[PDB]
């Protein structure tokens, strides 16, 4: 029952709960190579995301059914907003893994849209153009976890995370007009990340029954929630 936190207690707890940046197998590319390398990276990242979610203040206070629902609805959003964050300082490139840096060209090696690839490039470009901070990033990732699958306590946590995000802006010396304008620009991007997720979700469900790559046991169980 950790709703009493100050913003920096919320920030430091979220910063300390960050999963690590996992490495790929990366081989120094066909449609089977990429989809296989991203699948294994995704499956290994899912087990860290689960333990990260437990460490999100308020997530443990939910029942097991609700924790399952929130993760099943937001898990690709969370991977993509992480992908977009760690790709900031590689303009025009997506850093799936520190050894798996891809650009738009091989991003076309998948029948899945390169528009999704260019949407991720656009999203990371917007983060870079407005100097998105790591403290703000972990707040946005938390909001995805608690908001995407909401259909109270979660509404009291989202409000608190909003106050937290605005504490960051405050310090320092951006004006309220640009403080809630910055908040608005941040949250509107979450609308795009949800779009990239739905678009990406519908393609993973394609390669599911299309037998392109042996998926993971855990990865297929997330896809059974989007059907």
């Amino acid at each position: 029952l950790a709703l009493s936190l100050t913003a920096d207690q919320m920030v430091s707890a979220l910063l300390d709960a960050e999963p690590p940046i996992l490495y790929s197998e990366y081989d120094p590319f066909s449609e089977a190579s990429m989809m296989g390398l991203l699948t294994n990276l995704a499956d290994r990242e899912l087990v860290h995301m689960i333990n990260w979610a437990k460490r999100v203040p308020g997530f443990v206070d939910l029942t097991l059914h609700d924790q399952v629902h929130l993760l099943e609805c937001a898990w690709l959003e969370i991977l993509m907003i992480g992908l977009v964050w760690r790709s900031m300082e590689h303009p025009g490139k997506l850093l799936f893994a520190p050894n798996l840096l891809l650009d738009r060209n091989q991003g076309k090696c998948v029948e899945g849209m390169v528009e999704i690839f260019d949407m991720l490039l656009a999203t990371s470009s917007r983060f870079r153009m407005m100097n998105l901070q790591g403290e703000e990033f972990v707040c946005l990732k938390s909001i995805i976890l608690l908001n995407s699958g909401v259909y109270d306590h979660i509404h009291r946590v989202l409000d608190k995370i909003t106050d937290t995000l605005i504490h960051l802006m405050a310090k320092a010396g951006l004006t309220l007009q640009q403080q809630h304008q910055r908040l608005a620009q941040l949250l509107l991007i979450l609308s795009h990340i949800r779009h990239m997720s739905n678009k990406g979700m519908e393609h993973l469900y394609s390669m599911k029954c299309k037998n392109v790559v042996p998926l993971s046991d855990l990865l297929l169980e997330m896809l059974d929630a989007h059907r």
Binding site: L64, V68, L71, E72, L218, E221, M222
Partner: peptide, 8 residues
């Protein structure tokens, strides 16, 4: 479901 055990 695998997600159940991983969350407990």
């Amino acid at each position: 479901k695998i997600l159940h055990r991983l969350l407990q």
